[PDB]
Design a protein around this ligand. Sequence first.
Ligand SMILES: [Zn+2]
Ligand SMILES: [Zn+2]
Ligand SMILES: [Zn+2]
Ligand SMILES: [Zn+2]
Lengths: 293, 292
Amino acid sequence: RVNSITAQVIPQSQIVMSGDTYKANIVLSSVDTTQRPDVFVNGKLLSPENMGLFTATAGAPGTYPVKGYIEMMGNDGVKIRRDFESEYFVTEPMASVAPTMMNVLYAGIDNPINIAVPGVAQQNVSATINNGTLTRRGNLWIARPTKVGSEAIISVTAQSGGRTIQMAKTTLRVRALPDPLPYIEYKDVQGNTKRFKGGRLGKREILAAGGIKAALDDDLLEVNYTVVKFQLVFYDSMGNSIPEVSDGASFSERQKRQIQNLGKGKRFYVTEVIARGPDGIERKIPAIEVIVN
Amino acid sequence: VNSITAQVIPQSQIVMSGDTYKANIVLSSVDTTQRPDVFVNGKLLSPENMGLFTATAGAPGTYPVKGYIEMMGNDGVKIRRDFESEYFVTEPMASVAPTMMNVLYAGIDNPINIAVPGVAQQNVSATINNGTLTRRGNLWIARPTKVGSEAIISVTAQSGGRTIQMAKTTLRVRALPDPLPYIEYKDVQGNTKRFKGGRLGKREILAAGGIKAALDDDLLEVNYTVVKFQLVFYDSMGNSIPEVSDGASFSERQKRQIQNLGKGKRFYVTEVIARGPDGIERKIPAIEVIVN
Ligand SMILES: [Zn+2]
Ligand SMILES: [Zn+2]
Ligand SMILES: [Zn+2]
Ligand SMILES: [Zn+2]
């Protein structure tokens, strides 16, 4: 029945790292291009439109099996069926795509770093850092840099031979975690949570918050900042400034009363706002203008 | 009449994440009478190799895989099928990527280092799905356009015969950060310092001109200008007096109002609108100014 004999070079990978080995299966395919056989692969029957080609988008790295059967109608009316069991491997990319405004590490938090060596298993690799610690966590690494304003050099080595081979020297910048901005967490007329600029806000909506909260604008950077202490500035009949201290990240009873008896259009300020990041460093963050409405 | 066999013929048995595994599944009619001969790169494969040809990767470059498969065509005539493929050896590398740090900023040039160590820059050609990704010397420049959406950088090597996907990188497009306001002043020695609030001298307020805005970042070497601001003063009757400014400089109204303020008296800088290389105008925080 065959009308087409073809030689094929089927490699494991078309790109190999120096020192690894190129492996290719060389096979003959004697087929009948007239036929359209039923291909059941990985619990699915291929649609005739696929023309025998099975495709799967490579997602997470690992060992993926290709298992099923092929069946076609023989010339005699006897179905001819053949089972198969093959496999493919998904790897990490062998191209580094690094935005330079992103090569940074933050002191005080876990910095997940993906150290990927193609052609070598995750165990054969060893990675070290010159600033802080670089430990393993599952399929990832964790950098905890200690010296802010200095460089962090990640040194990756694989060995896989007689002499220990250097794979990559990566220089990264060490920064303190950013300073947060203060805000007042409030629920709108619908009930949805919004974060005050300041500018203008209702007193019913002010007292609902119960204090000052501190966080970053982003989303860069998913970090917790707590308000240590803050002050509220008020104004008497003599035009003098009255700075009232707060009970931590919550309004004091002296302040709470002042806000109630204040009145619409009247302005108050939140000054000397000290916030604390995971690194434990207390930091002076900016002020907010609060207008009653 | 000899045996029929199922065959899974992939493009590659190893696929990098982001690429797609492609395999042709066929019924092949194998002759069990005689074993064929596989001659590849000047060597005849021994039956023990089971069709597997292996070569140790040495110096980086383009290596060809060439040869033929010979067999008896049942008609006293030997049949030959030639094959010609190739592999690439690369300088041994490792990718060190901090996973949290995946942001591109809209409104500026985002230098991206796309490194495929073994190959040369001509060989590599990267594309982006959000904005533009152009070449600049030994680097690439992403200019993302849609804030809050994803930016997927696709790096390819193309070449003969098949087009190989090198990397698919997921990035987040975010707006440039907002700067913080400051008043630039020279101390008693002449050294420049930046006041962000708290207490400050009278003559030292008068110099410099008005308010300045900046972000402190040595990677994002961007600059912002103060568009407009207000100074909110307080009289003897406890009333708020909001005086507008002449751009990034104090107005003659504000200047004289600061002059008649006694020691300890408080005034504010709110609102404060600043724009960057974006170039987007943005409401930045306020400053409490106390006279010394
Ligand atoms: Zn290998
Ligand atoms: Zn296996
Ligand atoms: Zn039959
Ligand atoms: Zn913003």
